[PDB]
Amino acid sequence: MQLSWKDIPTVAPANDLLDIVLNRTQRKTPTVIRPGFKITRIRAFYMRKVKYTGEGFVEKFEDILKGFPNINDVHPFHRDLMDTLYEKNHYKISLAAISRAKSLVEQVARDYVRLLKFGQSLFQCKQLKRAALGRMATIVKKLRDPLAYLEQVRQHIGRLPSIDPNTRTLLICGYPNVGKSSFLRCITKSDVDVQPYAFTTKSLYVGHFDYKYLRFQAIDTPGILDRPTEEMNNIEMQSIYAIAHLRSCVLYFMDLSEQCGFTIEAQVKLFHSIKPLFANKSVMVVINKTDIIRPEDLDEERAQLLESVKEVPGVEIMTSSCQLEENVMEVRNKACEKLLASRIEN
Amino acid sequence: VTLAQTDKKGRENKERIFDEVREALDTYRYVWVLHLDDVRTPVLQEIRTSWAGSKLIMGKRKVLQKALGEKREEEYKENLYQLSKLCSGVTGLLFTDEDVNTVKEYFKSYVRSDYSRPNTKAPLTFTIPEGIVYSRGGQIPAEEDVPMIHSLEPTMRNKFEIPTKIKAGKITIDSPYLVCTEGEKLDVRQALILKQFGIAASEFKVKVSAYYDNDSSTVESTNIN
């Protein structure tokens, strides 16, 4: 439950669930009733079978009903994971439909057992029990879509990394087309591709590294795109949400290299977009490939923009590269020290 | 089963082939007969653009024999039976009244790049350096080179089971392999290799060993290689 919802028991389609419940009940219920019996025995047998079917359906539904947590209020500090993944409204509609069906099945069973209490003959009792079974079949067949959405939701949430919001953490973000996963590879151990693409990573990823005698976790942003500045896809919206609702120290990356996805054309727009969402989150900036771009010959025209950025107090730009194993360590140690200083002061 | 709109042609194709060949037999003066069986669609496009004043009409060997005459008694033109058994594979017919020497020189001198894969050949030795493979055989430098995908590795590990100059999947070999040698007869794996990258090591020309005249309408057959 807490940051890990892998405990969902199992999901079957509506038709499969109906078939399973029906066959299991028909196997477990005695099937030998003769006319040479008093009406009490017949009534007892059929009441037992119908109530057992009702209880079986109720127990088959209650587990999945309780498995999914209160997504409206579970981690309001973070929230917004499965909605961002696929959707929220139709998900809640389907769950509410399942819950309504659960709240109606037992009422139908109680009403029908009350009606059949006054049964009189084998023909009429068989007919009414067949009617009850048909009502159950209809009310389980009228929810084919909710199970279909439920399967996808369960599969999506199964492979979801656990994130602890109320613990120490760090975040890495930057413009894509730079090899963002390289920091993850050089810091922690996991599986990711470093292909020369905008989307080096395709989802959120959390590390488990340990330095300064303590353990820390770093969250990688899949990427940032700000062409409309408001309307993105899941890849960018999840990153922007994580940046917004987290006070963890954030390291920002822009590629000041002649070879990149955007060259040097949109970093100013990046800074303008992030400044409203970068206020008290310990902004950190690094640059890669310094040993091959030679920052000693940087142009003053772009140095004016760098100074304009530096006008904001929380700006620090240095030279580092992932091709070595000294600059990366120094940068990470400085980030950890800044985090420690921030938490000591605050 | 089948889930496509395309269906079998039938025999109206055969009927229209008969009609077109019988009507086209009487269009120009000088018919054409050649010896070139296996070709490619770009080559057909090139030859048709060159010979637009002709007709690139061809069909089954049996139907061509039927049109030319299965017996001496029946014949569209005088001495058309010698053209029936003239060729055994696949060849077409043309009606060009341009010249003789010019067209023969065109045939003997034309050369294009393609793939042949013959049993007897004298090809250059082709090797696969290093463990990492390449799709062209390593001709361009590794700096400009590009990698490949190992998803189709079982295909080469089962059907090929040998390092390949062309059509190579990302594996590692302890030593380079000379997939091609001078004066060697290619096997199934060699025929499969040397096709992916399109590097046409083969030169295709026109080998002409056929002729026929219509005003003379008599026996004619050359042999030029």
């Binding site: 020369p196 002649e258 070879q259 996805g261 060259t263 | 653009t49």
Partner: protein
């Protein structure tokens, strides 16, 4: 020295995408900013028009040229203003096509057209226009093929 031949497509009058052009200029080491400036200079003739840009490289020397495409030429034949609006979707130039621009759109491709004659080039262009689906000469493009076949519309040939 060595000559590199490659084909790329971009938007006229705009800087080429460095992310897409990175494999092309990877070993070359040329500046993608300079490449984008060259693309803009070469494609300034067409504004917001998707056309092909050449990248002729011989010992890493910039050389670009513009070669149009059939669909783009069909779009731009009417000379209608090309505009992109975030509030507009599924909008395209479907104005009536006169035979005056039919001759030009056949002639531009006739040099590289497989069809030997201007009639073949014109019928191929008519098939392309029927594929595109724009109105032609206040007439349905479907019937122009049979009109050509029956001689209803004559295409001058020289």
């Amino acid at each position: 020295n060595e000559v590199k031949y490659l084909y790329l497509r971009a938007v006229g009058g705009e800087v080429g995408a460095s992310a897409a052009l990175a494999p092309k200029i990877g070993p070359l080491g040329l500046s993608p900013k300079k490449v984008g400036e060259d693309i803009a200079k070469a494609t300034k003739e067409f504004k917001g028009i998707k056309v092909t840009v050449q990248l002729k490289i011989q010992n890493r020397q910039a050389a670009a040229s513009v070669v149009p495409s059939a669909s783009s030429l069909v779009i731009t034949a009417l000379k209608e203003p090309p505009r992109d609006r975030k509030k507009d979707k599924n909008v395209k130039h479907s104005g009536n096509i006169q035979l005056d621009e039919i001759i030009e759109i056949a002639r531009q491709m006739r040099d590289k057209s497989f069809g030997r004659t201007l009639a073949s080039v014109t019928k191929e262009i008519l098939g392309t226009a029927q594929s595109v689906g724009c109105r032609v000469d206040f007439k349905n493009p479907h019937d122009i093929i049979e009109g050509i076949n029956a001689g209803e519309i004559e295409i001058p040939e020289n």
